[PDB]
Amino acid sequence: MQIFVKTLTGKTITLEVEPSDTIENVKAKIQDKEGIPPDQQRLIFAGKQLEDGRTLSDYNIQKESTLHLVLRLR
Amino acid sequence: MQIFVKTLTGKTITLEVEPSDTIENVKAKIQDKEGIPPDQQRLIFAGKQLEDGRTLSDYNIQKESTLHLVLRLRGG
Amino acid sequence: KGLVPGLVNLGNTAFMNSLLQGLSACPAFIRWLEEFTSQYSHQYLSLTLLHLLKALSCQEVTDDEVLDASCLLDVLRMYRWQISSFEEQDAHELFHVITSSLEDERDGSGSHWKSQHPFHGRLTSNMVCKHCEHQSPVRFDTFDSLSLSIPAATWGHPLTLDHCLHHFISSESVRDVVCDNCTKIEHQRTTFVKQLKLGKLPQCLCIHLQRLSWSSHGTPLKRHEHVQFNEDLSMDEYKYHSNASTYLFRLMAVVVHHGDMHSGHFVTYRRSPPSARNPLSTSNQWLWVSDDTVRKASLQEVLSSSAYLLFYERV
Ligand SMILES: [Zn+2]
Known part of the structure; x- marks a missing residue:
């Protein structure tokens, strides 16, 4: 299925993912397309952060859902 | 006066308003007949989205005008 | 190739970027804009819209061009559409915000006050009382878009755009x-x-x-x-x-x-x-x-x- 990740940097990333995919796994997909460390990534859905331990289906993330990627540069 | 409002069904309803009435006044009267909170309403007339704090006069809404009600489908 | 330039989305503006791509796919709207804009030969929305509408209508000048319509949002949200900073918005609402500015802009022009933009249509409201059978004189109102309620679904049959139009009329x-x-x-x-x-x-x-x-x-x-x-x-x-x-x-x-x-x-x-x-x-x-x-x-x-x-x- 297809999902959108709205980064705040002017790029809306289109990702092909599975409901079984894990966040850590989605953050990895982001890194491959946009070269951002997964430690710096914060994935948000419906206004709440997604834990690296869960799958997309744990948050009812369906096809053509929209995530928001916030960065944590420290 | 009497104006009309085409609702989210396309069913038209009768409203009782005055020229001095504000737009939120009209929205509140639509809520009494339709139950949609005014903050979620959008009233379009003559191709113009009416603005709160304005009156039907400022838009020249004459008797038996047809207002169009739509919701707000946000996407960012 | 045949690709068009993209649009930068900063802070939840897909409602705008999406609408602009759609507007820029309308040659007539750009032609009316270019003719309307000619009277001015930076808060003229028609001008700022034309700059982005023209660039999106032609192919990308550079390789994988990504344009920026921050100028359009900042002009509209100054006074006309004071929206919250990062709030998601309805693309249809922005369409009517863009239209109302073009109409207001056209109303303040000595040369072009008569020229309607190509999105301008007219609706007829017919009425007749059932108790006395007396017909009302036909009203005429402006529309810049047709907002059709989607009717109830039929069992197995798909919903058609023509069903919506028949429900509207x-x-x-x-x-x-x-x-x-x-x-x-x-x-x-x-x-x-x-x-x-x-x-x-x-x-x-x-x-x-x-x-x-x-x-x-x-x-x-x-x-x-x-x-x-x-x-x-x-x-x-x-x-x-x-x-x-x-x-x-x-x-x-x-x-x-x-x-x-x-x-x-x-x-x-x-x-x-x-x-x-x-x-x-x-x-x-x-x-x-x-x-x-x-x-x-x-x-x-x-x-x-x-x-x-x-x-x-x-x-
Ligand atoms: Zn009668």
Whole structure:
């Protein structure tokens, strides 16, 4: 299925993912397309952060859902 | 006066308003007949989205005008 | 190639980027803009809109060009549309914000006050009292888009755009209407039959499918069902006047919403810019734009999409 990740940097990333995919796994997909460390990534859905331990289906993330990627540069 | 409002069904309803009435006044009267909170309403007339704090006069809404009600489908 | 430039999305502006791709797929709207803009030869929205509308209508000048429409949002949100900073918005609302500024802009022009933009159409409101059979004199009102309530689904049958149009122009009985004729026979209140039909058609038809409805329970409900639209659309059925000119429209762009009733994302299906060899013929290669990302699309993909705003232009 297809999902959108709205980064705040002017790029809306289109990702092909599975409901079984894990966040850590989605953050990895982001890194491959946009070269951002997964430690710096914060994935948000419906206004709440997604834990690296869960799958997309744990948050009812369906096809053509929209995530928001916030960065944590420290 | 009497104006009309085409609702989210396309069913038209009768409203009782005055020229001095504000737009939120009209929205509140639509809520009494339709139950949609005014903050979620959008009233379009003559191709113009009416603005709160304005009156039907400022838009020249004459008797038996047809207002169009739509919701707000946000996407960012 | 035949790709168009993308649009930077900074802080939840897909509602704008999506609408601009759709608007820039309308040659007539750009032609009216270029003619209208000529009277000024930076807060002239027509000018700032034309700059981005023109760039999106031609192919990308550089490799994978990503344009920035921050100028448009900052002009509108100064006074006209003071929106919260990062708040998601309805692309259809922005369309009517862009229209109201063009109309206000046209009203303040000595040379062009008579020139209507190609999205301008007219509706007819017919009424007749049922108790006294006296017909009301036909009203004429302006529309810059047609907001069609999506009707109830039929069992197994798909929902068509023509079903929506027939539901919009359908007749209906309105109760508690004041009748002058009945009043003098006090203020008698009868019930009339009312009907909307299209009096004038625009060169640029913008259809708005109300994918956001209100449930019986009193909660916002988002209609996800596929509405089946055609590449070619005939509007003779929905006109007021019997006088038979053919009214055929051809699809230029489709604005699609992805999400629930509260938030989501907007993308656009649009045609490619015409070829340089024949720049007045509509291209057949369709494009898919998600803000900055621009990719080739099949006509089948376009028509299989959950349409929200359908942009048509008369042929
Ligand atoms: Zn009567």
